[PDB]
Design brief:
Length: 52
């Protein structure tokens, strides 16, 4: 999966603001973190839509 290794290589975790972030394959904790406090933040804040 070269084309892939490149995609991430270039792309990769890229963000400019907690709210504005870009999660990629290399998500892992990085994502979970930002992910939690980034998009899902406002989202749920707008309508968690059930818990757990």
């Amino acid at each position: 999966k070269v084309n892939m290794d490149l995609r991430a290589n270039l792309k990769q975790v890229k963000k400019e603001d907690t709210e504005k972030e870009k999660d990629l394959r290399d998500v892992g904790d990085w994502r979970k973190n930002i992910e939690e406090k980034s998009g899902m933040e406002g989202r749920k804040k707008m309508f968690e839509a059930g818990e757990s």
